[PDB]
């Protein structure tokens, strides 16, 4: 029988993965500090990677990639894109961004002034403020490291409603660093006419819970724009996912390591009116849509867990 431990009680995704493992009759849950485990569903912060893979006779697997935080923190994602030659500062699918400490404060002003002299609305985050001139953006940050990012002034607006939205894609990377894209995404749509923030925390007018799934969104792109979700958007999404994950692969891969890692990521995209996809952020501990919990969590057990610990049509797109 296989053994596992739970170190993050607040994870709705792995609270469902744990009860799926406890439903196969071949997985037993141990106390959270028992070191004789096969699988660790670890804590979000300060996961003790240094104590993994030192139990004789145990293949140990953990649900987080050590070092993947460079991709999932806003300040370090900007630094990773501008300093990695695989991505370049000439990267076309990531909005112009600058890391400033309350430093790229002077480089931000040179780019800001050069286009105000010639629309330049920016956004601050790390607590969100969207201003039109640079003097107001810098005063709010001195009230932790922030990033100033070019705000997409021309987004793709759904009709009827004239409303903003964003796309969430779930990506699973297994221990062999295979990149699996869940075939089901969600559009966290705004219910107000363009309303600038589309986070589900911020109702129910055009779709239940401000969530439009891929089937309805693809049907809309065919009727309104005479294109498909695969062609207009999903090719760019698959390209961005591959670019980000292949860039950090030599840094985080566990191929020749004494323990193995997998991880589920949440990619947030935005689409402009020219059907160009932009990367907003990458989430290292993401939640799921209520309908897609059962299918995705079962896919996590099949692809990431049972591949290492075998029991007695794929929902993912392999990139």
């Amino acid at each position: 029988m296989y053994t596992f431990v739970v170190r993050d009680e607040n994870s709705s995704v792995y609270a469902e993965v744990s009860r799926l493992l406890l439903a196969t009759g071949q997985w037993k849950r141990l106390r959270k500090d028992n070191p004789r485990f096969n699988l660790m569903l670890g804590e979000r912060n300060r996961l003790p990677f240094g104590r993994l893979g030192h139990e004789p006779g145990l293949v140990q697997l953990v649900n987080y990639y050590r070092g993947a935080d460079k991709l999932c923190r806003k300040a370090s994602l900007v630094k990773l894109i501008k300093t990695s030659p695989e991505l370049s500062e000439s990267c076309t699918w990531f909005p112009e961004s600058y890391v400033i400490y309350p430093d790229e404060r002077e480089v931000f002003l040179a780019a800001y002034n050069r286009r105000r002299e010639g629309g330049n609305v920016w956004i601050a985050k790390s607590g969100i403020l969207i201003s039109s001139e640079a003097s107001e953006l810098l005063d709010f940050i001195d009230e932790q490291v922030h990033v100033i990012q070019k705000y997409l002034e021309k987004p793709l607006l759904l009709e009827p409603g004239h409303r903003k939205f964003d796309i969430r894609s779930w990506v699973l990377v297994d221990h062999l660093y295979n990149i699996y894209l869940y075939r089901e995404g969600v559009l966290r749509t705004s219910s107000e006419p363009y309303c600038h923030l589309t986070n589900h925390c911020i109702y129910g007018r055009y779709e239940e819970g401000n969530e439009m799934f891929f089937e309805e969104f693809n049907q809309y792109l065919m009727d309104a724009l005479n294109t498909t979700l695969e062609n207009s958007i999903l090719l760019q999404i698959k390209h961005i996912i591959r670019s980000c994950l292949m860039c950090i692969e030599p840094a985080i891969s566990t191929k020749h390591l004494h323990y193995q890692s997998f991880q589920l990521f949440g990619f947030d995209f935005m689409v402009d009116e020219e059907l160009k996809v932009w990367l907003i952020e990458v989430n290292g501990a993401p939640a799921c849509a209520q309908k897609l919990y059962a299918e995705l969590c079962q896919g996590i057990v099949d692809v990431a867990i049972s591949s290492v610990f075998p029991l007695a049509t794929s929902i993912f797109i392999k990139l």
Binding site: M1, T3, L30, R31, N34, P35, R36, G57
Partner: protein, 426 residues
């Protein structure tokens, strides 16, 4: 050269001790006359631990035989290996102890105890570096229980920095000689708590149940019980008698098995145990599963009712050391609930190439489990059932003991039980 001095006291102690020396004399190639006739140098490499080498390349057990009546020791001297013991090491009286702890500890035993210490001193003075003592005795009688614990207290006084180890047979109403056995065992257990470093708890109830239910012996005798013990005593001392890395001496064993000084009472186990099929070859997974089964352990305690503080497992014979590690880590990872999480890697494994005389493979289990409190609970319950009515006390007050000494022995064992319950919840 790290010599051990062996002492066997009373009827049970001498009959079990005799079988022990017969068994390990065969393993080391020593005939009943003391002559070596083996075919492997591994038999002689650490033979000085239990044997002295006399004139003519003869090996004499470093054993001292003690009793308050001559009966049992006469039968030992007339036994199969009776001539191998040094005749001077027979120390006995004539009055007997009447299954009375007070007689063994305070009156009859006190008159003989100095003669035993003279022999102990003589064997110790011929030790290049004595490491400690091992005592074989029962707790239910008078000599092994009362005088045996008197011997331990006086040995500790004269050798305070040496290890004291005992094989202690615990009484049970199912295999009982007299009704005062709970009195004698309660008085002795407190002595062992204070004055031993390692005590192998051998329950006569468990020995009987193993002979009856497992070995399919309808009417077990004391000889049948002692057969199991000698095979277990051979297993638990394999690390002391043959070259090895783990628990190679008494003090290193104590450092690995005893996290708290008073909790030093071990559950022993042996595998295989089969009825008479007996020619069937045993595999490593079968040895491991039986070795950890409650039906193979000899303290009559369910380890699933407690948790293991430390575990020692010794495999004897030619087998795959890789396969030994796999099954050991298998039962350890599949049942991690019964091992304490605050002592990492508390299960140590050893392998000896030389198997017992009749087996190709065998395994011996040594567990320091908090479930051993069930044994002390049983004895406490039986003690209280009689003491609340002061039943049979006159046998003891007639020897000068007071009721207060019984009250203190009752409290000391209840404290011992509570100390185990403290760490079973931890």
């Amino acid at each position: 050269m790290r010599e051990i001095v062996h002492i066997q006291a009373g009827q049970c102690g001498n009959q079990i001790g005799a079988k022990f020396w017969e068994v390990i004399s065969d393993e080391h190639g020593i005939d009943p006359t003391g002559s070596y006739h083996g075919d492997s140098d591994l038999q002689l490499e650490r033979i000085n631990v239990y044997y002295n080498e006399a004139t003519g390349n003869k090996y004499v057990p470093r054993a001292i035989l003690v009793d308050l009546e001559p009966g049992t020791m006469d039968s030992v001297r007339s036994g199969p290996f009776g001539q191998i013991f040094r005749p001077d090491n027979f120390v006995f009286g004539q009055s007997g102890a009447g299954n009375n702890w007070a007689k063994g500890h305070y009156t009859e035993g006190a008159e003989l105890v100095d003669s035993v210490l003279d022999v102990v001193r003589k064997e110790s003075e011929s030790c290049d570096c004595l490491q400690g003592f091992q005592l074989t005795h029962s707790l239910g009688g008078g000599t092994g229980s009362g005088m045996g614990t008197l011997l331990i207290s006086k040995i500790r006084e004269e050798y305070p920095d040496r290890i004291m180890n005992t094989f202690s047979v615990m009484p049970s109403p199912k295999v009982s000689d007299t009704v005062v056995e709970p009195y004698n065992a309660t008085l002795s257990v407190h002595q062992l708590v204070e004055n031993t470093d390692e005590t192998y708890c051998i329950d006569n109830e468990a020995l009987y149940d193993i002979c009856f239910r497992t070995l399919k012996l309808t009417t077990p005798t004391y000889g049948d019980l002692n057969h199991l013990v000698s095979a277990t005593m051979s297993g638990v001392t394999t690390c002391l008698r043959f070259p090895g890395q783990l628990n190679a001496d008494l003090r290193k064993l104590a450092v690995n098995m005893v996290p708290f000084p008073r909790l030093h009472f071990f559950m022993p186990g042996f595998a295989p145990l089969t009825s008479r099929q007996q020619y069937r070859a045993l595999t490593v997974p079968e040895l491991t599963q039986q070795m950890f089964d409650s039906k193979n352990m000899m303290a009559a305690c369910d380890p699933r009712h407690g948790r293991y503080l430390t575990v020692a497992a010794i495999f004897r014979g030619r087998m795959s050391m890789k396969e030994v590690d796999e099954q050991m880590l298998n039962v350890q990872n599949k049942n991690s609930s019964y091992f304490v999480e605050w002592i990492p890697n508390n299960v140590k494994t050893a392998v000896c190439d030389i198997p017992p005389r009749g087996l190709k493979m065998s395994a011996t289990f040594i567990g320091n489990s908090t479930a051993i409190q069930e044994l002390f609970k049983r004895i406490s319950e039986q003690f209280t059932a009689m003491f609340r009515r002061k039943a049979f006390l006159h046998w003891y007050t007639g020897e000068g003991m007071d009721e207060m000494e019984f009250t203190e022995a009752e409290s000391n064992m209840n404290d011992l039980v509570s100390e185990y319950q403290q760490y079973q919840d931890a």
